[PDB]
Design a binder for this molecule. Structure first.
Ligand code: Z99
Ligand code: Z99
Ligand code: NAG
Ligand code: NAG
Lengths: 751, 761
């Protein structure tokens, strides 16, 4: 095998994927130009700069021992044993291992190293399982894990008010872990997940078309959350382009700003918000790497193979198939681009160097060279004390922005700094643009964002509706709620439902707008009541004329008492009014009852033929009965009828609700008794007066009995409203007055 | 020192041959019981397997046994050889039979999981090693340490011991078993009251404080122990000093060890300790009592073991006649587990060889690169062989589970007190899969003398004292006596369905009180009957006098039909009053009250038709009108019965039983119309009588008519407020109504008496 061994006071391990993963007999084949060679050269350059530095380990010279992993987990595991065999080919004591570019390789290397207390710092491993310190207690990394971008995307969705999202992921540790993180972080921001699904590694177009069709089923989820790898993202974009659709893709580092995702499908992906890890370019590394040739780089054993594989030429034992490598061939900007994790590798190396420097200054002051008790290094002390607590600026900062500080949290992970991109079109040229940044809080540039179509997507389910019309109710979840109208006679709550504040009130524009209706009975001064009013006026005029003609004659009082009852009967119609009062209704009812009683009892003296005093005493008993009800608590303030079942907008409190129900019954009983007495007395009397007088008395008694019998069913079946209750009473009292007045005056006016 | 043999398949080994020692020496003293005997047991098992024609007849098993020195770092360093023997002349380790301490086993499993090497332990009992996510190539022939928690939970459930006072330990043994027991106690409805944590570095005063904290809860006799061997002797001594009984249910830490109870006899008597079941190996004793440092060159540590146990030297001739046969030898308690692990590995290898090398019994080319994954998943975890060297009668099965753990098999012990001998232990049961004890052998926790109870929640409530209240308790519930006004419909609360009626024995039928609608006994039942009989006799005498006076000029002047109608009405009302004191029913009570009302109406009509003729002075017209009025009143009453006469009466809430009524309960509304009609008729009759009585005819019968008018009306006016007031009370209402009916009849009888007297004289 091949390795890079450099003698020094302190030796750092190394694990890079120099050779890409192979199959068959060959374990590892072709050389990885971007991930293996460039990162290895970056580590060597950082070590050289540290050695040349005078403020970082001045007396201590930093060695190195770099081994290849061949992009294979088992190969890396078997190659990590030389890092631990030195603590038991002369072995070299390894202070720390700066290695691990794949999640599985880093996982197994950490599993092996944690038993021997060897710190390990990774530069490209972003797996979330490596953050579990119970299983990996000597692992650190300068790159953030893969669930920070999920939180960043959730924050973006919350800022853009995209509650109804449609998340689609991939198959594997990456996609599943990220989608789990997304659906455990979105619930904290009241973001719901719709049609959550994942794609597999079947590499079939039918599955992707089915995924697109399933996504198109829901039309309230305009934004789509993608956390899938590059090939899956490209296949999904192609499937969306086929059978054209419209979506707003919120992607992750799998998509990023790579142009490989979009090729021939630059229209469906328009206005896609993507996340890419921020990585400042190291300018000092360009001069170091571009000035490397196989003639002076004798340290790197893989450099010759990398040269022959990149330039497709041969140096020694060249055959006719491959041309001989030409002179003056060197790496230049024409065919060289920096890997996006060179700064991460440099930060890992400098973090290990700073930890070693801090240990050297703490264990023994006033000295530069290596001291006693530092020949053997304690891994726990190096990691948990001098490595997890470092605050230094990133080396080779082009402008020293002061935001690039290398530090590890409690779990050993790095700081999450992502760039928010937006695939837009400017001047007919499709390209990306950094429209935001996510260090600890989201900071977007909304002005330069070009969304799908020409407006910001809504992607919201259950758009709000009027609370007064429809009640907000969530059937199964807070995500979507249906607008269902509530009853129009009840007000609205905060967000729950509609409840009523009792009968007699109606809601208004205000939220708690139910108020008592200021409505009473209907005035009849200029309304339907005309005929009964005219009849009552004519009866009152006739009674006044009868009183006037009777008063003028001086014994040519008993008739005046009967006329007084008629006069007291007349005011009953005037008493009926919509003005509320708890005493007026009872007074009117008692007056009407007393008037009927005295009018009916006035004929007793005529039928039986001192008697005047008894009649007055009998009349007082009826009045005493009427005022007896007022003594008790039967009388009460008027109250609106409880017509909740009836669809009545307003209610009128005018019948006092306790007066009529008993007053009518008592008056009917008294009237029935006196009418029976008068009917019995009329037939018994053998006309103790003029011939016309007895007939007139009999006709008056019959008319009063008939009127009372006709008015009795009206009282029970009145169904008291603003009209019927007053009209029936007015008709009854007018008929009662007319019967007495007519039979009392016609025989008198005739003679 | 490395012990290596030669064979087609080489088996690794890790034994604690040397103790921890400390910083003074590398390893330290040689362990003679856990490092030497177990190593020799593995060697003996390997020899028997190599000489077994039915177990790997062609493949010869080897040995690569190393020393862990009771250290995890040393174990990792030594297992690095097992790693870099199959990874890269190094042998080929197909599996390691090693691991006696939990930390060594964890470290070795962590190292060997990466390189796919199976590991079967023989003495590692821990709950962390059962986590297959971290140790997916680790198996063991011993049950884990959380099975004994289940065993003691079942023991407590069998003896109905719910209120426990368990005491745990500090470290690794106990700090998981106590949580395992607590998890397994909730399923059996066992609640823990007080829990202490005994520590390794702990003062005797702290032990006394712990024991005193056990006295804080009085009704907790039992105490589950998860303490170590050295952490239980101090607790026993403290309990002896404080003179507490405290029957113990201890784990394997106590077992049957005589070094933990000695010096504290008297306080630990009756304890229930459990020890892992292990049978001695007959052949292993003979094999071990045959070795000498001269003929045993395979073991490199046998030299030091012989130098240590036999105090002598080998540089100079000091010990040559010493032999292990003369020395009494006791087998280690985990030798059968070692041989079972070795035989399980051999059986897995044999099964793999059968399933992969079917051509010849020799190791074929296919099985040369032994893989750990397939061997562990398909062969190691699927062995069902009989235990080697088992007792002939006893049937022992060796098999693993989904987690690779061994089969639980514990022995239940009891610390007896011999009548003639001294204190000793004795097995009283076992626990393989289900609980099994010999209850007729425990002397102190015996059922004959009454087993010790630990509930702290008594049940003195059976049917009426049950309340089941618990201020934050789920294992038990205290019942508070509730008032008898409630019923035990539900066994969780006093269902106060009704305060008046008393529930039955079942306390489930919350309905009206079962009783008989009887109210007339001997106090006033006879009195109403006597009054009714006197009224009937007076009516009969009046009828007889009238019959004797039927043919007389005096009777001709007056209307005899009216007198007959009045007599009939009086008889009807008297009969109704007499029968009103009877059991109510659909056709009895309401019919009787309707008849009484009809009789009152008929009496009023008779008075009206008696007074109208006097006032006038066709006679049949008045009789017809009265008959029509009576028929109309009866029809109104009947219509009230058919339409609006629903009747039911029962008092339930205040200290009362069901009211004695069947259908005459709402008769007040039904009789209201009849009462109003009767009042109107009486008023009309009184007015007619007042207007009348001017004519002195029929021997001044108008005086009698006026007497009736002034008597019946006054009686009705006096009774009406009484009837209205008495209507509230059912008992008062009936007697008052009967008395009023009787008085109404009696007034008419007294008024009619005078014409009868005149007829007689
Ligand atoms: N940082 C990565 C992230 C990686 C990844 C990134 C995008 C898409 C797929 C994908 O595959 C998985 C799967 C699980 C965990 C991490 C990843 C790493 O390997 O850990 C990878 C860039 C580093 C490198 O290999 O150089
Ligand atoms: N089986 C044991 C159990 C052991 C143990 C047993 C009783 C008291 C204390 C105690 O210390 C702990 C702590 C944690 C886990 C297991 C134990 C093992 O070492 O795993 C040990 C008997 C085996 C041997 O060493 O021969
Ligand atoms: C999201 O809604 C809040 C709530 O009113 C609003 O303040 C904010 O501006 C919205 N953000 C958008 C529309 O990007
Ligand atoms: C435990 O209680 C049950 C009833 O729940 C009883 O049948 C059993 O005999 C009891 N066991 C004893 C008293 O040991």
């Amino acid at each position: 095998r091949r390795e890079i061994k450099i003698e020094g006071d302190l030796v750092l391990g190394g694990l890079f994927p120099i050779n890409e993963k192979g199959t068959g007999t060959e374990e590892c084949g072709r050389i990885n130009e971007d991930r293996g060679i460039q990162r290895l050269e970056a580590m060597l350059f950082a070590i050289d700069e540290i050695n040349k530095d005078d403020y970082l380990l001045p007396g201590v010279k930093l060695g190195v021992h770099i081994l290849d992993t061949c992009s294979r987990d088992t190969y890396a595991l078997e190659q990590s044993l030389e890092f631990v065999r030195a603590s038991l080919n002369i072995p070299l004591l390894i202070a720390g291992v700066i290695g691990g570019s794949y999640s599985s390789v880093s996982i197994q290397v950490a599993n092996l190293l944690r038993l021997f207390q060897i710190p390990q710092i990774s530069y490209a491993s972003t797996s979330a399982k490596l953050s579990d310190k119970s299983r990996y207690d000597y692992f650190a990394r300068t790159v953030p894990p893969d669930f920070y971008q999920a939180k960043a995307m959730a924050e973006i969705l919350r800022f853009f008010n995209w509650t109804y999202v449609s998340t689609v992921a991939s198959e594997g540790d990456y996609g599943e872990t990220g989608i789990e993180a997304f659906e455990q972080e979105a619930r904290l921001r009241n973001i719901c997940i719709a049609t959550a699904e994942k794609v597999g590694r079947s590499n079939i177009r039918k599955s992707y078309d089915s995924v697109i069709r399933e996504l198109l089923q829901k039309p309230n989820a305009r934004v789509v959350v993608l956390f899938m790898r590059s090939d899956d993202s490209r296949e999904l974009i192609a499937a969306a382009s086929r059978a054209n659709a419209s979506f707003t893709w919120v992607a992750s580092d799998g998509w990023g700003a790579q142009e490989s995702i979009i090729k021939g499908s630059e229209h469906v992906a328009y206005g896609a918000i993507t996340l890419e890890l921020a990585s400042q370019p190291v300018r000092q590394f360009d001069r170091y790497f571009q000035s490397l040739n196989p003639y002076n780089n004798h340290r790197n054993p893989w450099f010759r193979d990398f040269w022959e594989q990149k330039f497709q030429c041969s140096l020694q034992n060249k055959r006719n198939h491959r041309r001989v490598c030409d002179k003056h061939l060197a790496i230049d900007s024409s065919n060289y681009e920096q890997e996006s994790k060179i700064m991460f590798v440099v930060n890992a190396v400098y973090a290990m160097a700073h930890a070693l420097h801090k240990m050297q200054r703490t264990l023994c002051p006033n000295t530069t060279k290596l001291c006693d008790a530092m020949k053997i290094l304690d891994g726990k002390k190096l990691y948990k004390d001098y490595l997890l607590k470092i605050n230094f600026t990133a080396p080779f900062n082009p402008n020293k922005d002061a935001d690039s500080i290398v530090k590890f949290d409690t779990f050993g992970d790095g700081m999450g700094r992502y760039n928010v991109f937006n695939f837009q079109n400017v001047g007919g040229k499709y390209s990306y643009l950094k429209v935001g940044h996510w260090a600890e809080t989201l900071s977007l540039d909304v002005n330069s964002i070009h969304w799908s179509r020409n407006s910001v997507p809504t992607s919201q389910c259950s758009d709000p509706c009027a609370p007064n019309e429809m009640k907000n109710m969530q059937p199964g979840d807070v995500c979507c709620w249906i607008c269902i109208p509530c009853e129009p006679y009840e007000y609205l709550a905060d967000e729950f439902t509609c409840m009523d504040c009792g009968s007699g009130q109606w809601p208004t524009a205000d939220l708690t707008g139910c108020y008592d209706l200021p409505e009473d009975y209907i005035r009849w001064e200029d309304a339907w009541a005309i005929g009964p009013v005219t009849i009552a006026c004519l009866g009152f005029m006739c009674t006044c004329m009868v009183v006037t003609v009777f008063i003028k004659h001086n014994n040519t009082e008993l008739c005046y008492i009967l006329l007084f009852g008629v006069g007291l009967s007349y005011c009953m119609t005037f008493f009926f009014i919509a003005k509320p009062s708890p005493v007026i209704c009872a007074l009117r009812r008692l007056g009407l009852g007393s008037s009927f009683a005295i009018c009916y009892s006035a004929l007793l003296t005529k039928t039986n033929c001192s008697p005047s005093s008894q009649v007055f005493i009998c009349l007082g008993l009826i009045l005493v009965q009427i005022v007896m009800v007022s003594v008790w608590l039967i009388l009460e303030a008027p109250g609106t009828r409880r017509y909740t079942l009836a669809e009545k907008r307003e209610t009128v409190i005018l019948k006092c609700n306790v007066k009529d129900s008993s007053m009518l019954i008592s008056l009917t009983y008294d009237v029935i008794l006196v009418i029976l007495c008068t009917v019995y007395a009329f037939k018994t009397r053998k006309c103790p007066e003029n011939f016309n007088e007895a007939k007139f008395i009999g006709f008056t008694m019959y008319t009063t009995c008939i009127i009372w019998l006709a008015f009795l069913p009206i009282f029970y079946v009145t169904s008291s409203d603003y009209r019927v209750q007053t009209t029936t009473m007015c008709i009854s009292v007018s008929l009662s007055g007319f019967v007495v007045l007519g039979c009392l005056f016609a025989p008198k006016v005739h003679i | 020192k490395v012990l290596t043999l030669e064979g087609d398949l080489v088996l690794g080994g890790l034994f604690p041959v040397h103790q921890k020692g400390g910083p003074a020496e590398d390893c330290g003293p040689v362990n003679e019981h856990r490092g030497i005997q177990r190593l020799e047991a593995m060697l003996f098992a390997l020899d028997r397997i190599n000489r077994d024609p039915h177990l790997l007849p062609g493949v010869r098993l080897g040995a690569h046994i190393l020393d862990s020195c009771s250290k995890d770092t040393h174990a990792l360093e030594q297992a690095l050889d097992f790693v870099r023997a199959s990874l890269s002349a190094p042998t080929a380790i197909t599996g390691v039979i090693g691991g006696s301490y939990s930390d060594v086993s964890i470290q070795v499993a962590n190292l060997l999981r990466l390189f796919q090497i199976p590991q079967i332990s023989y003495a590692s009992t821990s709950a962390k090693l059962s986590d297959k996510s971290r140790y997916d190539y680790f198996a063991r022939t011993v049950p884990p340490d959380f099975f004994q928690a289940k065993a003691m939970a079942e023991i407590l459930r069998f003896f109905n011991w719910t209120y426990v006072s368990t005491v745990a330990s500090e470290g690794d043994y106990g700090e998981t078993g106590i949580e395992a027991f607590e998890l397994e106690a909730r399923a059996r409805n066992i609640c823990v009251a007080t829990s202490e944590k005994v520590g390794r570095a702990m003062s005797r005063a702290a032990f006394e404080g712990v024991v005193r904290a056990l006295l804080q809860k009085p009704s907790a006799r039992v105490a589950v122990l998860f303490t170590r061997s050295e952490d239980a002797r101090e607790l026993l001594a403290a309990s002896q000093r404080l003179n507490a009984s405290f029957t113990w249910v201890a784990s394997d830490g106590w077992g049957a060890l005589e070094s933990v109870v000695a010096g504290s006899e008297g306080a630990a008597e009756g304890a229930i300790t459990i020890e892992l079941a292990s049978y001695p190996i007959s052949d292993f004793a003979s094999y071990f009592q045959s070795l000498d440092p001269w003929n045993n060159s395979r073991n490199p540590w046998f030299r030091e073991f012989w130098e240590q146990r036999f105090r002598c030297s080998f540089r100079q001739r000091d010990c040559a006649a010493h032999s292990l046969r003369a020395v009494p030898f006791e087998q280690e308690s985990k030798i059968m587990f070692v041989v079972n692990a070795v035989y399980a590995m051999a059986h897995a290898l044999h099964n793999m060889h059968r399933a992969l090398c079917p051509n010849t019994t020799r190791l074929c080319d296919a099985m040369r690169p032994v893989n750990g994954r397939r061997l562990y998943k398909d062969f190691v975890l699927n062995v069902k062989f009989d235990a080697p060297f088992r007792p002939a009668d006893t049937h022992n099965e060796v098999r693993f589970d989904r987690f690779g753990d061994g089969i639980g098999r514990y022995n239940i012990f009891t610390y007896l007190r011999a009548g003639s001998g001294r204190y000793r232990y004795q097995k009283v049961g076992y626990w393989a899969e289900g609980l099994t004890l010999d209850t007729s052998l425990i002397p102190w926790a015996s059922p004959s003398a009454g087993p010790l109870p630990a509930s702290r929640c008594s049940e003195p409530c059976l049917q009426n004292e049950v309340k089941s209240v618990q201020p934050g308790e789920v294992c038990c519930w205290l019942c508070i006596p509730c008032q008898p006004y409630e019923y035990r419909l539900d066994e969780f609360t006093c269902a106060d369905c009704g305060l008046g009626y008393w529930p039955n024995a079942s306390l489930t039928g919350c309905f009206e009180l079962p009783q008989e609608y009887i109210r007339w006994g001997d106090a006033w039942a006879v009195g109403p009957v006597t009054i009714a009989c006197l009224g009937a006799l007076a009516t009969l005498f009046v009828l007889g006098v009238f019959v004797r006076h039927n043919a007389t000029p005096v009777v001709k002047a007056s209307g005899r039909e009216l007198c007959y109608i009045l007599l009939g009405g009086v008889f009807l009302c008297y009969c109704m009053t007499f029968i009103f004191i009877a059991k109510p029913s659909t056709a009895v009570c309401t019919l009787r009250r309707l008849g009484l009302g009809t009789a009152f109406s008929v009496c009023y009509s008779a008075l009206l038709t008696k007074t109208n003729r006097i006032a006038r002075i066709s006679p049949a017209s008045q009789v017809a009108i009265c008959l029509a009025l009576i028929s109309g009143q009866l029809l109104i009453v009947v219509a009230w019965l058919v339409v609006e006469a629903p009747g039911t009466g029962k008092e339930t809430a205040p200290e009362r039983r069901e009211v004695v009524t069947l259908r005459c309960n709402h008769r007040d509304a039904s009789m209201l119309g009849s009462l109003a009609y009767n009042v109107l008729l009486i008023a009309l009759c009184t007015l007619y009588a007042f207007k009348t009585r001017k004519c002195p005819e029929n021997f001044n019968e108008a005086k009698f008519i006026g007497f009736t008018m002034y008597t019946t009306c006054i009686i009705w006016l006096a009774f009406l407020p009484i009837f209205y007031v008495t209507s509230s009370d059912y008992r008062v209402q009936t007697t008052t109504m009967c008395v009023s009916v009787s008085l109404s009849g009696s007034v008419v009888l007294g008024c009619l008496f005078a014409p009868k007297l005149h007829i007689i004289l």
